[PDB]
């Protein structure tokens, strides 16, 4: 009873009518019958319905319809590229059936609210994916499918047509093909790969222009801030060597015992840290 | 290579599974399969094979030894450690597991760990030999106090004259003659008049003989003998012989008395 | 001043013995000592199960306990009244189960039931802007002339960690 859901599926209305079938469909993964839920998300929306059984969601920690993580809204291949691939799960036939069975007993014996072993891992995060995690609901995802009479030029329902009248996606784009099983296991997922390419460009971690340099060239200081903000932020890292301050261009230089600590302060800092409700931007030299 | 090797693996692998499914048990099939994957250094597969075999028959001690061995061969110390713990937990009576477990820890250098294991082992009140091995373990390091402590527990767990004698002898070997004497006193005190015989009393006599307390030896020999059963007959004879020897170490009066 | 684990005022990163300063994600499951005593090596066996469920492992468990007298409150049959309670609760629970089984033999649901949900995503832009939502659950009507939808026959191969057992001459051989 009650599905497991994204906030993005469930709807942008707080009031929702949602129907239930006892054994509605096989799950497209572990292939068992399971309680299925439909509901209307919104005014122009599509009537989504749960695609996979609740168990294999608890297993990989995901929405039932979307298969996007609960916290990050990221396809599974991504958050695995983000932490731990070694979760695994047999893809192969009768194994899948077997492992699902056992893991279904293991889950039965848990407190109920926890994605099994992954959650022991799931706490430690934020490497990148937080910064590539999506922020707001994305409703373009629930729109009705593309009317396929109209996309041949004919559709004779006129304005009534609940489907959507517009140009489809060119089958050329590798982002088209998108199997379900595939998106689930984290194989060759085009979306996930795209997000990976997007991850790399994040100006961030390579640093190291020069050896031993712990000099921090800090842009976007501002004249509200004091140094004491700086120190009481940065004593976490280690033994400071010193701090140079310039308020004429509002840039603050810093120096630490080891370069390692400076890299760190970059990492922890870059395009993340803000104090005095004002962004504190960092660069090398 | 790339594909050609692969096909080979399917034929073997599939065959192994077929054999297992046909016979179910007959764990020589399980083991051979495990060994083959081990040889290809696919040890994650190997682990699963061993666990599956254990599900079929957890009592089979060869299986467990092969499993732990496999982990050790691949330097997977902590896996092996886990496995050993399981083996002794589920089949505590199997001494082979305990001997190997302590040996492994000793090789790793973890004396404390090994001691801990042996203390667990001793809770099962095992067998004379196990206790000896624990004591010897201690004696590979100086640790004489530890050894003596173990003996103190051991001679009560298996209160056999012989063990008491052995304990005393241990003290003698390390020159704690004061304590050795005390141990003999304790032994005779404990056993009491009710049951004691030849061996212990002889050994005590020998001890005092070596301590050069000849008069005392005679006192002990006589007084303790008269205090108890005497004659059994064989034991008595042995004792008499010992006494004679001690004496040696007009005076053939009992030669005539025994004959007459 | 020390700069080593050996040796708040310091204003230094110091980690005194062995608190880890870099990610490891180590497998090891914490060794434990309980109250006065023992490294809880029996924790191996429980591992799969919950703390609640019992499992014998130490030698002490195996060793005999004596006597207990002609009788003591210690061994007795819960009582009349405990039995009545147990029996009654059992009876009702079984009956529920049986009725479900019996549903097959005897081939109608009308409840509208509302639920109130708290999400776990929140963030104030996720809903219109509500910490909760409400969902009216309705059971879908089944077509009575619909055949069994899907096929159950498929078959997949079949325990607990074994409890410890705690239980020859040449000529005999």
């Amino acid at each position: 009873d009650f599905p497991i859901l994204c906030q993005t599926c469930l709807g942008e209305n707080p009031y929702i009518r949602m129907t239930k079938e006892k054994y509605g469909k096989e799950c497209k993964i572990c292939a068992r019958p399971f309680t299925v839920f439909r509901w209307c998300p919104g005014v122009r929306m599509r009537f989504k319905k749960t695609e996979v059984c609740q168990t294999c969601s608890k297993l990989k920690n995901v929405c039932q319809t979307c298969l996007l993580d609960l916290e990050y809204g990221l396809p599974i291949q991504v958050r695995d590229a983000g932490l731990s691939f070694k979760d695994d799960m047999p893809k192969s036939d009768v194994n899948k059936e077997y492992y699902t069975q056992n893991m279904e007993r293991e889950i039965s014996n848990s407190d109920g609210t926890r994605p099994v072993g992954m959650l022991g891992k799931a706490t430690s995060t934020s490497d990148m994916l937080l910064k590539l995690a999506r922020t707001t609901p994305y409703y373009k995802r629930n729109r009705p499918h593309i009317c396929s009479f109209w996309v041949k030029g004919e559709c004779k329902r006129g304005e009534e047509c609940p489907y959507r009248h517009e140009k489809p996606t060119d089958p050329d784009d590798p982002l088209a093909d998108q199997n379900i099983k595939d998106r689930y296991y984290g194989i060759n997922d085009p979306v996930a790969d795209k997000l990976l390419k997007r991850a790399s460009t994040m100006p961030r971690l390579d640093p190291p222009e020069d050896k031993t340099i712990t000099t921090l060239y800090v842009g976007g200081l501002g004249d509200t801030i004091t140094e004491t903000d700086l120190r009481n932020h940065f004593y976490q890292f280690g033994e400071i060597r010193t701090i140079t301050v310039v308020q004429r261009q509002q840039c603050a230089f810093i120096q630490f015992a080891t370069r390692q600590a400076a890299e760190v302060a970059a990492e922890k800092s870059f395009n993340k840290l803000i104090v005095n409700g004002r962004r504190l931007n960092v660069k090398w030299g | 290579d790339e594909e050609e090797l692969n096909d080979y693996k399917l034929r073997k692998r599939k065959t192994f599974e077929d054999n297992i499914r046909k016979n179910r048990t007959v764990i020589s099939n399980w083991i051979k399969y495990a060994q083959w994957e081990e040889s290809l250094k696919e040890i994650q597969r190997a682990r699963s094979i061993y666990e599956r075999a254990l599900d079929v028959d957890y009592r089979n001690i060869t299986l467990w030894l092969k499993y732990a061995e496999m982990e050790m061969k691949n330097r997977q110390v902590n896996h092996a450690r886990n496995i050993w713990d399981r083996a002794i937990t589920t089949l505590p009576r199997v001494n082979q597991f305990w001997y190997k477990y302590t040996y492994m820890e000793e090789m790793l250098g973890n004396v404390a760990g090994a001691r801990q294991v042996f203390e667990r082992w001793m809770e099962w009140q095992p067998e004379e030999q196990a206790w000896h091995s624990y004591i010897n373990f201690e004696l590979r390091y100086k640790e004489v106090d530890r050894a003596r402590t173990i003996y103190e527990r051991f001679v009560l767990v298996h209160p056999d004259v012989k063990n008491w004698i052995k304990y005393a002898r241990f003290e003698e070997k390390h020159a704690y003659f004061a304590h050795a004497r005390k141990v003999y006193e304790r032994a005779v005190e404990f056993f009491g008049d009710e049951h004691m015989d030849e061996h212990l009393y002889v050994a005590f006599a020998k001890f005092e003989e070596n301590q050069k307390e000849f008069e005392r030896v005679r006192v002990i020999y006589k007084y303790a003998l008269d205090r108890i059963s005497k004659q059994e007959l064989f034991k008595n004879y042995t004792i008499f012989e010992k006494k004679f020897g001690d004496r040696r170490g007009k005076r053939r009066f009992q030669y005539e008395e025994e004959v007459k | 001043i020390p700069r080593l684990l050996e040796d708040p005022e310091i204003h230094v990163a110091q980690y005194p013995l062995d608190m880890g300063r870099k990610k490891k994600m180590s497998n090891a499951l914490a060794i434990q000592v309980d109250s006065e005593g023992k490294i809880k090596y029996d924790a191996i066996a429980r591992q799969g199960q919950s703390k609640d469920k019992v499992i014998y492992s130490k030698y002490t468990d195996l060793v005999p306990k004596e006597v207990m007298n002609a009788d003591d409150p210690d061994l007795q049959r819960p009582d009349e009244e405990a039995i009545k309670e147990i029996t009654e609760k059992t009876r009702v629970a079984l009956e529920k189960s049986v009725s479900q089984k019996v549903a097959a033999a005897m081939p109608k649901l009308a409840p509208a039931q509302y639920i109130r949900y708290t999400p776990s995503q929140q963030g104030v832009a996720f809903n219109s802007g509500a910490k909760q939502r409400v969902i009216r659950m309705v059971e879908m009507q089944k077509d009575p002339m619909e055949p069994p939808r899907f096929k159950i026959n498929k078959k997949i191969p079949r325990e607990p960690p074994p409890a410890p057992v705690m239980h020859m001459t040449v000529k005999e051989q």
Binding site: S92 | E17, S48, Q76, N82 | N27, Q47
Partner: peptide, 29 residues
């Protein structure tokens, strides 16, 4: 058919015990 040569038939990842198995990996043939 692929329950063998593609994907490890049924997998039991070994249970993890008081020691570190993170580091360990093995060589090819």
């Amino acid at each position: 058919g692929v329950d063998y040569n593609a994907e490890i038939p049924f997998e039991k990842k070994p249970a993890l015990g008081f020691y570190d198995t993170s580091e360990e990996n093995y060589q090819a043939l």
